[PDB]
Design an enzyme around this catalytic site. Structure first.
Site, PDB file in Angstrom:
ATOM      1  N   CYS A  79     -18.217  -7.851  21.883  1.00 29.80           N
ATOM      2  CA  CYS A  79     -18.043  -7.900  20.561  1.00 29.80           C
ATOM      3  C   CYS A  79     -17.046  -9.014  20.124  1.00 29.80           C
ATOM      4  CB  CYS A  79     -17.491  -6.592  19.676  1.00 29.80           C
ATOM      5  SG  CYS A  79     -15.891  -6.154  19.858  1.00 29.80           S
ATOM      6  N   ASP A 156     -14.972  -8.093  39.390  1.00 29.94           N
ATOM      7  CA  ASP A 156     -14.516  -9.391  39.729  1.00 29.94           C
ATOM      8  C   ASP A 156     -13.193  -9.378  40.600  1.00 29.94           C
ATOM      9  OD1 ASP A 156     -15.971  -9.025  37.307  1.00 29.94           O
ATOM     10  OD2 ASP A 156     -16.156 -11.127  37.318  1.00 29.94           O
ATOM     11  N   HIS A 288     -27.935  -8.453  38.905  1.00 34.20           N
ATOM     12  CA  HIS A 288     -27.347  -7.085  38.529  1.00 34.20           C
ATOM     13  C   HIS A 288     -27.179  -5.914  39.619  1.00 34.20           C
ATOM     14  CE1 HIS A 288     -29.238  -8.182  34.328  1.00 34.20           C
ATOM     15  NE2 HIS A 288     -27.913  -8.000  34.243  1.00 34.20           N
ATOM     16  N   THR A 517     -10.210   7.937  62.935  1.00 35.63           N
ATOM     17  CA  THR A 517     -10.752   9.362  63.128  1.00 35.63           C
ATOM     18  C   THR A 517     -11.260   9.623  61.915  1.00 35.63           C
ATOM     19  OG1 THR A 517     -10.393  11.597  63.971  1.00 35.63           O
ATOM     20  CG2 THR A 517      -8.652  10.501  62.750  1.00 35.63           C
ATOM     21  N   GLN A 653     -20.505  11.766  60.759  1.00 34.95           N
ATOM     22  CA  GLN A 653     -19.893  11.029  61.973  1.00 34.95           C
ATOM     23  C   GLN A 653     -20.496   9.668  62.175  1.00 34.95           C
ATOM     24  OE1 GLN A 653     -17.534   9.938  63.703  1.00 34.95           O
ATOM     25  NE2 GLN A 653     -16.845  11.871  65.052  1.00 34.95           N
TER      26      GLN A 653
HETATM   27  N1  LIG Z   1      -8.258 -12.838  24.406  1.00 34.59           N
HETATM   28  C1  LIG Z   1      -9.005 -11.623  23.716  1.00 34.59           C
HETATM   29  N2  LIG Z   1      -8.750 -11.249  22.764  1.00 34.59           N
HETATM   30  C2  LIG Z   1      -9.217 -10.409  22.240  1.00 34.59           C
HETATM   31  N3  LIG Z   1     -10.382  -9.634  22.568  1.00 34.59           N
HETATM   32  C3  LIG Z   1     -10.762  -9.997  24.038  1.00 34.59           C
HETATM   33  C4  LIG Z   1     -10.136 -11.292  24.453  1.00 34.59           C
HETATM   34  N4  LIG Z   1     -10.766 -11.490  25.876  1.00 34.59           N
HETATM   35  C5  LIG Z   1     -11.729 -10.433  25.811  1.00 34.59           C
HETATM   36  N5  LIG Z   1     -11.864  -9.726  24.582  1.00 34.59           N
HETATM   37  C6  LIG Z   1     -12.770  -8.863  24.110  1.00 34.59           C
HETATM   38  O1  LIG Z   1     -13.084  -8.035  25.373  1.00 34.59           O
HETATM   39  C7  LIG Z   1     -14.626  -8.066  25.791  1.00 34.59           C
HETATM   40  C8  LIG Z   1     -15.026  -8.068  26.981  1.00 34.59           C
HETATM   41  O2  LIG Z   1     -14.774  -9.491  27.431  1.00 34.59           O
HETATM   42  P1  LIG Z   1     -16.040 -10.255  28.311  1.00 34.59           P
HETATM   43  O3  LIG Z   1     -17.115 -10.119  27.914  1.00 34.59           O
HETATM   44  O4  LIG Z   1     -15.515 -11.797  28.574  1.00 34.59           O
HETATM   45  O5  LIG Z   1     -15.767  -9.592  29.856  1.00 34.59           O
HETATM   46  P2  LIG Z   1     -14.147  -9.041  30.580  1.00 34.59           P
HETATM   47  O6  LIG Z   1     -13.535  -8.438  29.436  1.00 34.59           O
HETATM   48  O7  LIG Z   1     -13.420 -10.388  30.705  1.00 34.59           O
HETATM   49  O8  LIG Z   1     -14.408  -8.094  31.917  1.00 34.59           O
HETATM   50  P3  LIG Z   1     -15.942  -8.416  32.730  1.00 34.59           P
HETATM   51  O9  LIG Z   1     -16.217  -9.691  33.470  1.00 34.59           O
HETATM   52  O10 LIG Z   1     -15.990  -7.131  33.772  1.00 34.59           O
HETATM   53  O11 LIG Z   1     -16.821  -8.036  31.889  1.00 34.59           O
HETATM   54  C9  LIG Z   1     -15.035  -9.221  24.708  1.00 34.59           C
HETATM   55  O12 LIG Z   1     -16.160  -8.590  23.895  1.00 34.59           O
HETATM   56  C10 LIG Z   1     -13.834  -9.377  23.665  1.00 34.59           C
HETATM   57  O13 LIG Z   1     -14.348  -8.899  22.354  1.00 34.59           O
HETATM   58  O1  LIG Z   2     -10.855  15.197  67.133  1.00 34.41           O
HETATM   59  P1  LIG Z   2     -11.401  14.636  65.797  1.00 34.41           P
HETATM   60  O2  LIG Z   2     -10.551  13.115  65.952  1.00 34.41           O
HETATM   61  O3  LIG Z   2     -10.490  15.264  64.830  1.00 34.41           O
HETATM   62  O4  LIG Z   2     -12.825  14.381  65.467  1.00 34.41           O
HETATM   63  C1  LIG Z   2     -13.534  15.164  64.429  1.00 34.41           C
HETATM   64  C2  LIG Z   2     -14.901  15.521  64.940  1.00 34.41           C
HETATM   65  O5  LIG Z   2     -14.863  16.504  66.183  1.00 34.41           O
HETATM   66  C3  LIG Z   2     -15.214  17.539  65.842  1.00 34.41           C
HETATM   67  O6  LIG Z   2     -14.098  18.701  66.481  1.00 34.41           O
HETATM   68  C4  LIG Z   2     -16.593  18.123  66.450  1.00 34.41           C
HETATM   69  O7  LIG Z   2     -16.842  17.414  67.724  1.00 34.41           O
HETATM   70  P2  LIG Z   2     -18.002  17.871  68.355  1.00 34.41           P
HETATM   71  O8  LIG Z   2     -19.427  17.832  67.896  1.00 34.41           O
HETATM   72  O9  LIG Z   2     -18.171  17.130  69.569  1.00 34.41           O
HETATM   73  O10 LIG Z   2     -17.746  19.099  69.324  1.00 34.41           O
HETATM   74  C5  LIG Z   2     -15.001  17.717  64.259  1.00 34.41           C
HETATM   75  O11 LIG Z   2     -13.897  18.166  63.717  1.00 34.41           O
HETATM   76  C6  LIG Z   2     -15.344  16.494  63.791  1.00 34.41           C
HETATM   77  O12 LIG Z   2     -16.896  16.130  63.885  1.00 34.41           O
HETATM   78 MG   LIG Z   3     -14.221  -9.849  32.832  1.00 34.17          MG
END
Ligand SMILES: Nc1ncnc2c1ncn2[C@@H]1O[C@H](COP(=O)(O)OP(=O)(O)OP(=O)(O)O)[C@@H](O)[C@H]1O
Ligand SMILES: O=P(O)(O)OC[C@H]1O[C@](O)(COP(=O)(O)O)[C@@H](O)[C@@H]1O
Ligand SMILES: [Mg+2]
Ligand SMILES: Nc1ncnc2c1ncn2[C@@H]1O[C@H](COP(=O)(O)OP(=O)(O)OP(=O)(O)O)[C@@H](O)[C@H]1O
Ligand SMILES: Nc1ncnc2c1ncn2[C@@H]1O[C@H](COP(=O)(O)OP(=O)(O)OP(=O)(O)O)[C@@H](O)[C@H]1O
Ligand SMILES: Nc1ncnc2c1ncn2[C@@H]1O[C@H](COP(=O)(O)OP(=O)(O)OP(=O)(O)O)[C@@H](O)[C@H]1O
Ligand SMILES: Nc1ncnc2c1ncn2[C@@H]1O[C@H](COP(=O)(O)OP(=O)(O)OP(=O)(O)O)[C@@H](O)[C@H]1O
Ligand SMILES: Nc1ncnc2c1ncn2[C@@H]1O[C@H](COP(=O)(O)OP(=O)(O)OP(=O)(O)O)[C@@H](O)[C@H]1O
Ligand SMILES: O=P(O)(O)OC[C@H]1O[C@](O)(COP(=O)(O)O)[C@@H](O)[C@@H]1O
Ligand SMILES: [Mg+2]
Lengths: 761, 761
Positions: A79, A156, A288, A517, A653
């Protein structure tokens, strides 16, 4: 203490980073848990502006069964009204109409900049609103202060003050799923994979993706390629071909530029590669897809934690404290003031506009620059004109774990870079006793990033039974340092060598444990290498199971997880999947607790939510096994719900390492090798290595905010060797969030939230 | 009978269709099973030309643990030498040096065209070779005939004579994984997802992807858009927006063209959408992703079957029989002469070059044209100016099955298109008794394709108990037909209503059963809707479970699959995963068989293969349970291998439908509605519908070759009602292939292979 009588607004704005739903769910359920009214603002700042129908009070079931959903059920919109005071005043009006003095904004850098400008003008907007006659002076002295807790939701990672943002890990999951389709194929002909990621402004995703996949070349706007890069890249691809490597991976960010302002298109790199190399070059553009899919396990846990901490920070915030961003630096939750983070983002943006361009990469964060240096070091073998007498062996010990191969790969390259003579031993300590030691080169670890399990062999055998053979082979090969990538048996073996130093002088060698371990049961770290992979596999199975009961049927699933006595895996998996209960050894439970939980399940099951999920750690109880719980839940739920059982055995394991595990093992293998080299130089005296001090045997450790080398002798105090776990585990606080999100009235006064901290310049 | 004393060459050429490794494995393991020598020709026609080191005799372990790997371990290469006689003579020489008179070629259209020209010149090449002096006249009279059995391995499906090719299903898995990343997210703002697939010559992948995803618009080279499509598309997206549908999907093949030769670029469509609509438009280009990833379950089974049949066809082939292509039309295996398929491919290519361009789409195959008509019908609601007094109710009965929702969507749209009054009853026969009948519209089923489970409720309750309520509700709502989508309970319930027609006049209504169940236990069909999804989920878990033992560790996994008494799921999953044994009810086994198989596993585990896997159907044996087989295998394997257990419970159940399941349920739902409309018009007399004959209640088939309609009363003879499965199942012959591929010496004289058939014009 409770925030009763006050209302919390939650909105999402910007690109719909997956994991937003987990943050919204945690924010809502924490807000109505503490008695605050939670209002969901639909379409973000859009519905903030128009308001009215777009602001609805939330109940517990309004955010039910969304944690696995990507995108955002609340919806986000761009926003322009919020940019101007005309719409921002309307937004302030609509917030006052609902008594929302507390706002949680989940969005990217622009979202949080807008939130900062909205706080800065909140007093002026309210003054102009009462002046224009839409609110009386009374009812305006209240709401005079607007509390803002920001959550960075974006793929990030462009917000400079923050190290990790919601959706980064999952965007990486999508990217590496695409890349693993290419790399896990039996590579048949010479082909070039040119991946275009949407990191138009920030190249963090491009960098971490390149590091995780071992990209041959990387175009990021932070570090545009030098003049004449056309030749330098094409030669690098040429020797890549000459090696016999049949796949080249080019990670090109959307914002790829040269040293001038001219952008570098993926089509240009395609045609360039085709012309000089003739490889079958096709450009994959995710588009994404990066924002798509389910949130990763890490994203669900961390979004839940930050949403909870966002609510708590928003209720303990007085009129004087500034707007904060709840984030994690390292593993430690922290609150950073919104103004400083926005200011740093503006400074880096000005720097990237050819102001301090060579010095903009450092202001992005030490994590970015360190990641880029590690990537370039591992990408191409530069000539190590330095040489050292040091020779180190790399072990894999214990159970296999996803990411052992990433650690060993980076350790091998980094050790070669320092001139060390690197050996690998197969079968862990069994091969080190049997002398199964093999010198390894740079290219011998080629393509080990994505391989799960262990390319080296793994064995659980401890060294104490073959200490004589181990010291013999150490003497034979002249092993001056010992890197052991493995679980609790790795730590225990290195401990047995440290304790055995007094008998055998040859064991006075620098030792380093990388904990790797599934169970995350190794002392001296917060995350074991490969725990993330196990958690991700566990939730995927649990989500599949929970999705199998169609919408009419009321069914509970008892899902048994691994992890030994360490309950970490069960509990985090429960948070990620919204499990009703995660039974673990560290929280002992009796039949009274089971009846409470079962009746709680039954009551919940009478409402609109129809699929329950309880997790059981494999070794949580001696008698109340999975079969016991099945009988209990199915009996008490007779006439209400059916019960089913699923023991996730080795499904948690053998999977390939998740992108976090690859990058994490990569970094720890580098950091372990750096410390190995530093300690070996510090300890080399009298013409030989003599490592007697406790500091020479450390677990690498990611602890709280930073990496921290803990001596194994010191860690022996805090180790429960009987149960093979540490005595004081940091993650027991996550149980409180788990129980809260399942309506259990648990007094979480023991939870400690991260305090305000200034940005680290 | 056996092909002893003769050698079989196997090569792969062209694009590396995933599932090629499965076909190569089956060809190899059949050729050395029957005693023939198998020679692997690396790099395809390249290594055919150079020969020498590129031609290696295969052993059983040469194709060990490759079935789950995409691409091809043999490797493919583009060689121009095979185009010219200079290199083709060298290829014939290298084949003669190893005595390879039998060649299996796994490749695309160009590969098979080259194989055809190579057979056609084999006599001339041998004559010129002996003339030039590289082979004596003796040793040339033998090998005078070269036997060619072709396998269509390509993602294009451009080979006209063949309906399904290896890798098409898995390429579709890649495509739909990307699309599901977009559609399953909570769609927050208006965005347009433009997916570009590599169907440069053939638009089959684009078409089936569009059908599975419900694309708003489709650009395929087979049917270029009419003049002025710019406005017509933009308006379609416009009303899509006006509906509130927040995501538009445009599938644009690489070979997208207009009515002239000018190609339509994805960037053009992007900028077009951006300019007129303003939606956030990003183009996703898969590129190499389509050929990536693991092969789907279908690809592994069909590749194994066709590779086995290729070997068998190659041994029963005399000097006179021509080169053949082993393929499946429908579920029936068939062999088509290579020459006729090459001729049809040339005819369609000439037609597509503006010769018979409007009539080229029909020569591509009736399946393509039918798929495009079904797609367009379901895509956009055209005005049904026709109307009819007929009304029909759609049920979901039994367990939920992936693809029921797709079937219901297609049935609703097709019924509305034919003017019928379509009802849907929630919870199946329970709702029909309880009167949970809700009239449904076009948009009420919007986006039901990708939704797993069942939007409508499912109940297993048979109609006999509440038959008075069912007839009452049929009378109240005037239900003239009944479309029952479900498992064995669906078929049994329709059978009960048919048997009760004698008591109740109202039950004399046309009925149709769509078999939709995990178990594939419904008589009258080969593939129940959603069996493919369960197989795919099962193998994915098995591949994970097999991936979990690593390095040195020798371990067998007993995996228990679902399916009731129907062993289908276990056996096909065992084929797909390379399971050693799949214990099923239909193949009764005693302890003697178990000791044989356990010793067989032990001997195998002493070899270099270290991960055995046996499947157990949940109800295969009364006493030899999964715990029993765990105890048996772990005891006898003591000192050789460890044993572990994993019961895949509802991991095989709740997944979203695979692309096969979506397309299949789409198509048969349309076909079931067409058949219902035809039967209802044929039965309408005296001003009312009176369906009393047995033919008015049929299970829609796909039984051998094409779709069939088997009356439920006739199928009652071949139904084991105690075990809820048919008495004679087509897939029991696949056990022979499973056991053969696991080194079991099983005399497969009962296996029947597809015979030669001419192309269907
Ligand atoms: N300097 C600022 N002042 C006021 N609001 C801010 C400022 N910066 C970011 N915002 C608000 O926070 C929201 C998120 O910012 P932005 O879309 O740029 O991603 P971000 O906050 O940096 O984190 P990300 O990268 O994970 O998405 C914006 O919609 C904005 O409204
Ligand atoms: O001895 P650590 O380091 O605790 O290893 C953990 C693993 O060993 C175990 O004792 C089982 O081992 P095993 O199957 O060979 O009998 C479990 O506690 C676990 O899967
Ligand atoms: Mg950001
Ligand atoms: N795999 C790679 N991908 C992208 N850029 C790369 C890669 N390797 C090197 N570069 C960049 O190309 C430039 C020259 O590379 P190179 O390392 O060989 O010489 P350099 O001047 O010593 O670089 P550096 O500062 O890192 O030591 C550097 O700016 C570097 O950042
Ligand atoms: N998941 C996997 N499992 C097994 N082998 C794999 C997997 N991924 C890649 N490989 C293999 O690793 C081999 C080596 O090439 P690869 O691409 O993987 O590494 P690279 O990029 O060339 O070297 P580097 O790690 O230094 O970047 C490939 O031929 C491929 O067969
Ligand atoms: N008309 C032909 N005559 C002889 N050899 C041919 C002919 N067409 C293709 N070939 C050979 O088969 C090899 C592969 O063929 P091609 O490049 O056309 O891919 P394809 O077999 O059609 O499968 P795909 O397109 O999916 O990759 C070529 O290298 C060429 O040597
Ligand atoms: N979802 C779609 N994707 C691709 N092409 C489409 C789609 N819908 C319609 N078309 C094409 O646009 C043209 C006109 O569309 P429309 O159906 O509305 O009129 P028409 O006279 O009935 O044409 P026809 O029935 O033969 O397809 C047709 O040639 C058709 O092939
Ligand atoms: N796996 C899924 N689970 C839940 N909802 C889904 C799934 N897939 C699609 N949807 C929902 O279906 C809704 C309907 O819009 P959608 O884009 O999916 O198809 P449509 O255009 O409306 O109808 P059509 O079937 O012809 O394509 C979407 O808003 C989407 O949220
Ligand atoms: O009855 P169908 O059609 O065979 O359905 C198969 C499913 O039913 C089962 O019996 C299990 O059903 P439930 O989970 O409800 O107990 C399994 O065989 C399988 O998961
Ligand atoms: Mg081809």
């Amino acid at each position: 203490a409770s925030g009763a009588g006050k209302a919390i607004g939650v909105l999402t704005s910007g690109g719909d980073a997956q994991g937003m739903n987990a943050a919204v769910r945690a924010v809502t359920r924490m807000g109505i848990y503490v008695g605050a009214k939670v209002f969901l603002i639909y379409e973000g700042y859009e519905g903030l502006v128009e308001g009215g129908e777009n602001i609805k009070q939330a109940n517990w079931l309004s955010v039910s069964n969304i944690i696995q959903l990507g995108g955002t059920i609340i919806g986000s919109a761009r926003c322009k009204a919020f940019t101007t005071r005309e719409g921002r005043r309307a937004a302030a009006y609509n917030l006052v109409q609902h008594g929302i003095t507390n706002l949680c904004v989940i969005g990217g850098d622009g979202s949080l900049t807008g939130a900062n400008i909205f706080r800065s003008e909140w007093g002026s907007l309210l003054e102009e609103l009462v002046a224009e006659g839409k609110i009386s002076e009374t009812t305006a002295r209240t709401y005079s202060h607007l509390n803002i807790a920001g959550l960075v939701g974006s793929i990030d990672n462009d917000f400079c003050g923050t190290d990790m943002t919601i959706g980064t890990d999952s965007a990486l999951h999508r990217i590496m799923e695409v890349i693993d389709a290419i790399t896990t194929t039996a590579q048949s002909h010479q082909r070039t994979f040119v991946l275009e990621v949407m990191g138009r402004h920030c190249g963090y995703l491009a960098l971490v993706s390149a590091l995780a996949s071992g990209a041959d070349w990387l175009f990021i706007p932070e570090a545009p390629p030098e003049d004449g890069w056309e030749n330098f890249m094409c030669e690098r691809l040429g020797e890549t071909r000459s090696r016999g490597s049949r796949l080249n991976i080019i990670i090109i960010a959307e914002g790829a530029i040269d040293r001038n302002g001219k952008p570098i298109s993926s089509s240009y790199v395609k045609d360039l590669v085709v012309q000089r190399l003739g490889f079958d070059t096709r450009v994959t553009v995710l588009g994404h897809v990066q924002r798509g899919g389910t949130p990763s396990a890490f994203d669900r846990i961390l979004s839940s934690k930050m949403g909870m901490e966002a609510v708590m920070a928003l209720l303990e915030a007085t009129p004087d404290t500034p707007a904060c961003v709840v984030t994690l630096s390292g593993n430690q939750s922290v609150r950073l003031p919104l103004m400083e983070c926005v200011q740093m983002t503006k400074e880096v943006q000005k720097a990237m506009d050819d102001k301090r361009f060579d010095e903009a990469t450092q202001l992005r964060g030490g994590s970015f620059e360190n990641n880029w240096n590690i990537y370039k070091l591992l990408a191409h073998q530069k000539p190590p004109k330095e040489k050292s007498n040091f020779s180190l062996a790399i072990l894999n010990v214990g159970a296999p774990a996803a990411g052992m191969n990433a650690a060993v790969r980076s350790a091998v390259r980094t050790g070669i870079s320092h001139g060390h003579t690197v050996y690998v031993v197969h079968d862990g300590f069994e091969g080190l006793a049997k002398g199964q030691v093999q010198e390894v080169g740079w290219h011998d670890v080629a393509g080990w990033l994505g391989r799960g399990g262990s390319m080296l062999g793994t064995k659980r055998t401890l060294p104490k039974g073959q200490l004589e053979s181990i010291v013999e082979n150490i003497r034979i090969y002249g092993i001056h340092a010992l890197l052991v990538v493995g679980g609790f048996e790795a730590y225990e073996g290195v401990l047995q060598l440290v304790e055995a130093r007094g008998r055998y002088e040859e064991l006075c060698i620098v030792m380093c444990v990388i904990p790797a371990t599934i169970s995350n049961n190794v002392p001296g770290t917060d995350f074991s290498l490969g725990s993330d992979t196990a958690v991700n596999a566990a939730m995927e199975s649990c989500d599949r199971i929970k999705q199998s009961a169609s919408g009419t049927k009321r069914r509970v699933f008892i899902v048994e997880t691994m992890g030994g006595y360490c309950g970490y895996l069960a509990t985090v998996t429960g948070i990620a999947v919204g499990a009703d209960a995660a039974y673990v050894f560290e929280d002992p439970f009796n039949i009274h607790d089971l009846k409470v939980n079962v009746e709680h399940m039954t009551e919940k099951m009478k409402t609109d939510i129809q699929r329950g999920l309880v997790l059981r750690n494999e070794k949580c109880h001696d008698y109340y096994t999975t079969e016991f719980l099945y009988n209990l839940y199915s009996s008490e739920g007779k006439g209400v719900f059916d019960c089913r059982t699923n023991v996730l055995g080795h499904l948690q394991q053998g999977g390939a390492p998740t992108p976090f595990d690859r990058n994490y093992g990569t970094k720890l293998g580098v950091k372990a090798m750096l410390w190995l080299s530093e300690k070996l130089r510090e300890v080399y005296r009298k013409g030989r290595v003599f490592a007697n001090a406790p500091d020479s045997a450390c677990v690498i450790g990611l602890k709280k905010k930073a990496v921290a080398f803990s001596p194994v002798t010191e860690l022996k105090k805090d180790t429960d060797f009987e149960h093979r776990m540490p005595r004081e585990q940091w993650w027991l606080s996550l149980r409180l969030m788990l129980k809260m999100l399942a309506q259990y009235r648990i007094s979480m006064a023991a939870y400690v939230s991260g305090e305000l901290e200034h940005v680290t310049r």
